[PDB]
Each structure stands twice: as C-alpha cells, then as structure tokens.
Design a binder for this molecule. Structure first.
Ligand SMILES: Oc1ccc(-c2cn3ccccc3n2)cc1O
Lengths: 114, 114, 114
C-alpha cells in the first residue's frame, strides 16, 4: 500500500519517527507486511481547506484490495487520529482519498503485481 | 471537492488571492459549499509538456459526483481560463484529470462521507 | 500520457536530460506522440518504502487507454530500468500506479477528449 499526506504544516512540525509510525500502523490496519508499505509526507504546501489556511491535510491511500466502506472508516479514524496527535491537524480539515487498485495496474520491480 | 495544480511557474508568479479565487470559483462551478472545497497549488516544479519546459500545469479535480461529460468540459474551460489569466499558462499545455469519487472512498473527520 | 515520479533522491542526482529521456521513451512505449506527453519529477521528498529511507520512488502513469496487463509490465520494466540507471533506485523500491483514464475525464485546452 501507499499513503501520501500533503499538508501546509511546516517541516519542523513533523515529528521525528512519523514516517515509521505511519508505516507500522498502516501495516497493522491493512493486514499487509510493513515491507510493502510506502509512505510520503509533503509539508509546507500552499493549500486551503474550506477557504481557510489553518492546518489541513490532503491525503491518499492506495491498496490492492483491503479498501471498502467499513475498512475505509476505520482507516480514516486511524489516520485522522495520527494527523491530529502528531501534526495538530483537526480531523475535519483532512481529506483522504481511497483507491482500490487492481494488481495489474501496480508496477513494482520491473513488472506488475498481476 | 479537491483541486490540485502542479506547475513549473515560479511561486512569486502565483497571484495573492489565487487560492481564495479557486475556492470560490469551484464552489460555484460544482454547486457545493466553499467549506467543502480544498485547493492546493504546487509551484516551482520540474516538469515538461510535449518535451518543452515552457510554462505548463498538471492538475486534478476530485469530487463526489458533479463529474461527467458536459460538466468536465465546463470545468476545463473555467480552470484553463483561470490558469491562462493568473499564471500565464497556455490552455494547450494543461492536463486536468477528473475523478468522480464514491463517498465510501473519501475519508474526512474520522470517518467517510458514506 | 502523464508520468510523475516522487522520490527521496536529491535534486543533484537527477541528471540533465532526464525529463526529455522520459518523454521520448514513453512516446515509444505508449505509441503516443511525444508532443502530448507530460512528465514531472519531484526529488528531495520525505518518504519511506518498507519502513526504509534508502532510495525509492512512488510514481504514476495516466493515459486514455493503452493501460493493461501486458502493457503495464512492459512500462514497469522500462520505467524501473530508467530509475535504476539514472537515479540509482532499486527496482524493488519503486511503485507505479497505472490509471486508464476515460476520455471524458481528461481536460486539455479548454475542453476534454470526449
Ligand atoms: O491518443 C492519445 C493521446 C493522449 C493520451 C493521454 C491521455 N492522458 C491522460 C492524462 C494525462 C495525459 C494523457 N495523455 C491518450 C491517448 O490515447
């Protein structure tokens, strides 16, 4: 799986250990090994959410399966929880787009997962 | 809805007021309240279009519904118009990818929009 | 087509001509004219792959058609080869998400391709 956070929070506000925490918790949440989890955090962005520029996050989570109604609500509770606790971003200023990828449309190691 | 613009245009060429203007213009174009509109602008990017490093933009619009043939032609006119006028980007050097998101696959405030 | 690479490799290790090589190679691989091909490289990112911060890349390729099982395998071989060769990223630390876009959902030059 792959998780990306884009935020206007400054780099210095991203605490040490954040990428590893995301890796571990997404491994636990998706049931997939931490070796297959990729994470990417992009601070200092020029962004607005609802017309204002208080801390906000625009995120995506791509996974081959493990995407669905109940699971996505659980992921959202998890990820908003981490973004509030670690980056001080209110959960109501976070969007997370979820993508159920087909294995044939994910490239890795010179091939795909098909 | 969520609008993201990635561009090689420099940061100082992004007019003050651009995020607010995109917000308001999108709220009106999509029929959704400005409070649900998120906008993100990423200047100074290493990018090319058609092999050329002349000014260009790669963008995305995600919305839960309000995405389709007619609407997307109208959004494309609106957004290219804005990019030409405010960032001096020629419409023919702009890609905008539209995504009609299912509400179950958009996380917000510890849950999803489902 | 549109190809984006996000990577933790520094700006300096991206070699001159990289964007142009990506454009020409994608022209051929996709059988699409190079004048329509957009490429974007984002270095110096804060990312991890399998919990490790060794060189990695998260990428996407979008296209109206020409996306499928065998084609995506051949794109991944090509693209992973380029990232290994030019940025010294191990193919097994690369993900490439492929998106087959509907012509109605791609905006260009004040309209769409529907
Ligand atoms: O004949 C074609 C010409 C251009 C694209 C194409 C589709 N795209 C979708 C997003 C970004 C770039 C992009 N290029 C697809 C085609 O089949």
């Amino acid at each position: 799986p792959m998780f990306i956070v884009n935020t206007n929070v400054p780099r210095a506000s991203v605490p040490d250990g954040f990428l590893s925490e995301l890796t571990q918790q997404l491994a636990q949440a998706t049931g997939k090994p931490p070796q297959y989890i990729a994470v990417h955090v992009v601070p200092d962005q020029l962004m607005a959410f609802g017309g204002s520029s208080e801390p906000c996050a625009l995120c995506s989570l791509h996974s081959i399966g493990k995407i669905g109604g109940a699971q996505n609500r659980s992921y959202s509770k998890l990820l908003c929880g981490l973004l509030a606790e670690r980056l001080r971003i209110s959960p109501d200023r976070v969007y997370i787009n979820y993508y159920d990828m087909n294995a044939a449309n994910v490239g890795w190691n010179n091939s795909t997962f098909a």
